[model samples]
Target: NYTFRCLQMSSFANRSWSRTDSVVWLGDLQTHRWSNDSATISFTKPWSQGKLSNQQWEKLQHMFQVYRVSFTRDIQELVKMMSPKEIEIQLSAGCEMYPGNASESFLHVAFQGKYVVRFWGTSWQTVPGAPSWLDLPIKVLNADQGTSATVQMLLNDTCPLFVRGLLEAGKSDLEKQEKPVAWLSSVPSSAHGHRQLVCHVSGFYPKPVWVMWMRGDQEQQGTHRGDFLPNADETWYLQATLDVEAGEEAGLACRVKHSSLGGQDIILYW
Candidate 1:
């Protein structure tokens, strides 16, 4: 006779066999590997590689068995319910610490690319809506151990030491500053009836800079758009554009305001 044990072993082994493009597994810790890419996500401590101990491996194997059944069953239900092209699930845990040793910890689960269910320090909240099946267990757990107990477990037993290490490493770079470089360009409009003046700023840090168009010393209230885009490095880049009528005689300039210039404004003439 057919048995559940044989089905479970086959299901666990062939979980992603149909999709040969990517495979992700989660049990004690999460792992993701793609066939086409050389990138991998194996759980590791911040700034260091991680190695699992023998006891941890043993526990993980036991946990994997439990998860395998539930996950496979859930995937079958989801596939039958919604014929989606792709599905993704992510689980994250983190803690935020304040200066006075007060901290808030959270666990988050994201499913189907759009839904997020979060367990904050004191309560559980879900985006969109909470599933009836998921909410009852979360409520029972909250009742059994108050959320404070969970938060304390994370702060004291989990991430406080690692968080402090990160703080110490980050303190050394707190005061390092990088200055912005600015330039201007004029592009012809599609109809050739006007010129679009663009102010480009790059190599800036802290991202609290301002760029505006000025005509003959007064701020020009012309049609303009501005945005900050990230650079390859950790710096920031900004582009501010203003449209001007063709052959306008008013002297135009791009004014930049930043802390790096020591309270003075830098101007680039057109």
Candidate 2:
């Protein structure tokens, strides 16, 4: 099976956005028949029309209606004839828009304007293409007596670093500052040996904190445990480790419950 993915990106004042549409269409071109063995396309479907700004709408429409059609033709025609006799063929096509190589500062900006299509298949043969297909090396062909195709579409219009960073900064500034109350790490030697448990807790502040370990869903009463230690920075780290039978890894976990960060659980495995 061959998979195809397509993407599109757009720009607006101080902001950018993107959209991706992917579909799985399976057809056997070499045998001139469709295959019953198929799977659903893994992608988000186009959403209902949103209240797009004038500039956004223009860019969106141009990409899907104009550029998209041209791109599809190029790809479809490239694989138009799948002959069992010939292992490869060259596809000639060009992008209407200039390559984004020049717009570097807008690398993210250009990325937002960019898209990607990926193909994956098994039992397929690949051969070199002409300089036209951007000289893309190793386009695949069907190795079996039959051939199949899969394609997806995607568009990048979302502003990556700037927007995400701004949101994280705003959230951090608004939230209350809290110091680390605990830290934990562990390494299991072997699952065939008898079980062992170890734990430690350290921190400074209003005091009065408890730490423990649990195997499966039950708490253990006696195990290697330590009193909480305080640091000059008023922060702390809680540590724990556990070992279980070879087949019981799924039923073991380490838990740290604190007054500040609430309860956190870490699973143990060999």
Candidate 3:
């Protein structure tokens, strides 16, 4: 399985105004073959009109061809070294653009199974003091040069202009109203005869919200906060869990507060 996430944020007027854009793909977890914030493209269905230019699509196809081969070969090499049955590899790339002709970019690859960093590069060049195994292959493949060229092309010729256009086009959608929905669920805990009550909050936009477990008007303690995960449609999901005895005589509720609710909160009772 291959997972990719990319985010770009730009600012104007001495950081007074800012906009963020992102793309993510979780190959193993996705129900559809390909999708974005704009549209879903299912493997079993016809292609939907997603937010991509023809040129952008072509470049993405090329990137897939190049990186897939590299990732597979590297994984095979890693297996030869350690022979692990299951391994996870992550490749992260990011770029930041600043005012007055300043910019920076980075690429990092790591193996999560062994907690080892395979490669780390910045601005198209491999950083100094990287592992010998990574350095040799990178040198032989001219990977740094290739990555640098690609990044430069995108940053200089493609990204800035396209991103501005997208920001302008998406202004209305970005300003639209959205609210989160909260629910409560229970699952058997590892400790026998106990259950974990999970307060799930999802389908929120603009990504700023607060979720808490409450008993009547009082706040509940000993709750576990889960990571704020991203939904396929660019919304967010969060889970707050608390251990509880079955049939306990305690009133429980999931409370959510968001800007869209305008000083109001959504509460789900159990």
Identify the superior model by lDDT, candidate 2 or candidate 3: 3
Which one is best on TM-score? 1
Question: What digit string (tens of lDDT, one per residue) describes model 1 on residues 1-270?
Answer: 000000011122234632212332211111333232222223322322123444644554455344445555655554454423224555455555676755554556666444567766466666557555555545654575644464555444445454444445344333335678899888887766888888998977656788888886678777375777877665679988888788772588888888777877789888
Please give the lDDT score for candidate 2. 0.34
lDDT of 3 at 52: 55
Clash number for each model: 0, 30, 0
**Candidate 1 vs 2: which has more lDDT:** 1
TM-score of each: 0.59, 0.26, 0.54
Model 1 misplaced regions, further than 4 Å: 1-14, 17-86, 91-104, 122-128, 136-152, 155-165, 190-192, 223-225
1-270: candidate 3 lDDT, tens digit per residue: 122224222212222322222233222122124322323223321221124576765665577455544545654654455433323444454344455434444445554423233223324234455445655455654655766576566545444444343334444554555678888889998988788999998888766778878888777777788998988776788889988788762578878888889998998888
Question: Quick one: ranking by TM-score, best first?
Answer: 1, 3, 2
lDDT of 1: 0.55
Question: Candidate 3 regions off by >4 Å?
Answer: 1-91, 97-103, 109-124, 127-130, 140-150, 174-177, 187-195, 229-234, 245-249
